[PDB]
Amino acid sequence: YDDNEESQVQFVGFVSRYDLMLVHTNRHYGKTLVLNMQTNKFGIIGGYIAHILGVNAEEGDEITEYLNEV
Amino acid sequence: IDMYLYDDNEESQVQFVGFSRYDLMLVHTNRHYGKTLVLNMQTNKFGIIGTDDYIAHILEGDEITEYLNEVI
Numbered sequence: 001y002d003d004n005e006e007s008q009v010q011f012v013g014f015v016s017r018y019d020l021m022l023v024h025t026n027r028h029y030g031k032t033l034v035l036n037m038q039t040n041k042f043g044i045i046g047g048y049i050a051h052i053l054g055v056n057a058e059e060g061d062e063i064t065e066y067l068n069e070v
Numbered sequence: 071i072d073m074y075l076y077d078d079n080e081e082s083q084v085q086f087v088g089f090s091r092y093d094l095m096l097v098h099t100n101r102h103y104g105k106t107l108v109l110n111m112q113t114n115k116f117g118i119i120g121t122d123d124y125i126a127h128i129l130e131g132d133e134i135t136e137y138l139n140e141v142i
Contacts, residue, residue, distance in 0.1 A: 008079050014075055
């Protein structure tokens with residue numbers, strides 16, 4: 001199959017230093033795509049963040065603190 | 071959490087493709103100078119891919135390379 005969709009990509013960086021990419025698509029039922037540009041791992045989010053982004057426990061909490069905010 | 075470095079948006083085209091069995095996502099973005107983002111659903115890993123450049127590294131990777139040549 002091939003499906004195309006126009007979506008808003010959000011590049012974010014905050015300070016460890018983190019640089020994330022956020023893809024908002026309708027295919028994941030409100031869930032957001034979070035791409036870690038430094039570890040090149042991604043996950044669909046609705047210590048799972050630390051495990052799904054390849055990052056230690058409290059780095060994952062800092063990503064989680066940024067993610068629940070937005 | 072002392073400093074918020076940046077926060078910018080951009081309209082981008084996302085492709086959902088399906089062809090052992092592979093499920094990929096392709097994000098085209100002006101931020102990466104024409105290089106296409108290739109996401110692997112099953113392995114949850116991605117990479118900024120260009121014609122010049124590893125595939126199985128960053129993502130049975132030889133068959134992914136065959137399909138990506140038909141897109142880029």
